[PDB]
Design a protein around this ligand. Structure first.
Ligand SMILES: *[C@@H]1O[C@H](CO)[C@@H](O[C@@H]2O[C@H](CO)[C@@H](O[C@@H]3O[C@H](CO)[C@@H](O)[C@H](O)[C@@H]3O)[C@H](O)[C@H]2NC(C)=O)[C@H](O)[C@H]1NC(C)=O
Ligand SMILES: *[C@@H]1O[C@H](CO)[C@@H](O[C@@H]2O[C@H](CO)[C@@H](O[C@@H]3O[C@H](CO)[C@@H](O)[C@H](O)[C@@H]3O)[C@H](O)[C@H]2NC(C)=O)[C@H](O)[C@H]1NC(C)=O
Length: 366
């Protein structure tokens, strides 16, 4: 989690040091074997080579699987970023255009109707429920902070996946090079280089066991964290957003509550009233100047655009797409990363066994 001292971190560290103790017992087993063989057949080497080839292959499969999983997680985060960015742009544009509409309505009324000054009550009415609409739309949840934190998480996971991809392909390359130099030493007469590469192989064994440790730690941590993630997302993020909206988004396979149809109804009725009053101004604009009629027709098309924007908005608030993105992210984390990372754990175990067998076949050369 966030702090550096708790049971979860201690549990993961205990698993890691248990794997390190496994590495230690492996190395002391190697030491006792070497001292026993210094105190006073091709089948095993062939089996070791086949096992190490199978290990590196299954590890490459696991790394590709986790690469694909992280890639689709980043894709889902990108879709969520796009959706919230579109929501934010739509709401900001609607507010900005509404303010512009208020100011231009004030201008066109002062230009013409100020001479008569009889529909001042109507003008005050439009002003008052326009302000009511502004207040009601101010109640929508702004999505700037979630976009910022999700972009930060996307950057972090991109960096982490790039680092892991590079490091583990380095590990695959090193394993292949060790296999090739083993074959070359088997064929060509053993030079001192076969005595030099023994320490390199031992260090690579140590690295493989450390990989097993970190792999098991990450696997258990991620599995436990995404077993019931909803509580974690509520705790870490649900501070400036009320719990009901978060629970709606995280769990809306059915229409649980959806406590926002009142807002859509009030905007729809406000806009219908706006259409009615605009039509009233048109039908009072017959004896007036054509400039008033042109402005009114422009306002009518403007209201049409506002209505279609509101329809796009209410399409975007519906939790189908966001819930689909969440479910895709959840499955791509657990059901993909866990399995790939476990396959990588089997990689580490099999590679450790393979190095053990090669060291078993080490001293017998000379
Ligand atoms: C979603 O991910 C994209 C990553 O491609 C990021 O979008 C950000 O949105 C801004 C606009 O608000 C974009 O600005 C773009 O960059 C040029 C740079 O000169 C700018 O002048 C233009 O206005 C152009 O639209 C840009 O794609 C990006 N901003 C950055 C990278 O600083 C962002 O991570 C996410 N979008 C959000 C959070 O709105
Ligand atoms: C903004 O949208 C409104 C409606 O959404 C439109 O203004 C006028 O709307 C009425 C009612 O929909 C239209 O009357 C109907 O026209 C159809 C055309 O096929 C006709 O079949 C019906 O019997 C009825 O008469 C009216 O035509 C329409 N005004 C214009 C100029 O088309 C219009 O889409 C937008 N208002 C503008 C551009 O001023």
């Amino acid at each position: 989690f966030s702090p550096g001292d708790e049971t979860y971190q201690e549990s993961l560290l205990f698993l890691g040091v248990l794997a390190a103790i496994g590495l230690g017992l492996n190395l002391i087993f190697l030491t006792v074997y070497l001292v026993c063989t210094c105190c006073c057949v091709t089948w095993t080497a062939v089996v070791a080579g086949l096992l190490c080839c199978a290990a590196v292959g299954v590890g490459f499969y696991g790394n590709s699987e986790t690469n694909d999983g992280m890639h689709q997680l980043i894709y889902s985060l990108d879709n969520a970023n796009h959706t919230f960015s579109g929501m934010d742009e739509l709401v900001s544009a609607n507010t900005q255009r509404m303010k512009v509409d208020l100011e231009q309505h004030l201008a066109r009324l002062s230009e013409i109707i100020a001479a008569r000054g009889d529909y001042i009550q109507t003008l005050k009415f439009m002003q008052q429920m326009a302000g009511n609409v502004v207040s009601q739309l101010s109640g929508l949840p702004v999505w700037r902070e979630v976009t910022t934190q999700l972009t930060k998480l996307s950057h972090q996971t991109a960096y982490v996946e790039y680092y892991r991809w590079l490091s583990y392909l380095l590990l695959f390359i090193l394993d292949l090079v060790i296999c090739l130099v083993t074959c070359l030493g088997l064929a060509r007469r053993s030079k001192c280089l076969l005595a030099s590469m023994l320490c390199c192989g031992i260090l690579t064994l140590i690295l493989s066991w450390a990989s097993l440790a970190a792999d098991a730690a990450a696997a258990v941590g991620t599995s436990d964290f995404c077993m019931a993630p909803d509580i974690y997302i509520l705790n870490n993020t649900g501070s400036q957003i009320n719990s009901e909206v978060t629970r709606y988004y995280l769990h809306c396979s059915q229409s649980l509550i959806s406590p926002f149809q009142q807002s859509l109804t009030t905007f729809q009725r406000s806009l219908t009233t706006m259409q009615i009053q605009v039509g009233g101004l048109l039908q009072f604009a017959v004896p007036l100047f054509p400039t008033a009629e042109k402005d009114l027709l422009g306002i009518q098309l403007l209201l049409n655009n506002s209505e279609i924007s509101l329809h796009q908005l209410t399409a975007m608030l519906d939790c189908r797409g966001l819930h689909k993105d969440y479910l895709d992210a959840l499955t791509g984390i657990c059901y993909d990363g866990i399995e790939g990372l476990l396959f990588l754990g089997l990689f580490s175990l099999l590679a450790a066994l393979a190095f053990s067998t090669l060291t078993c076949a080490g001293p017998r050369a000379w």
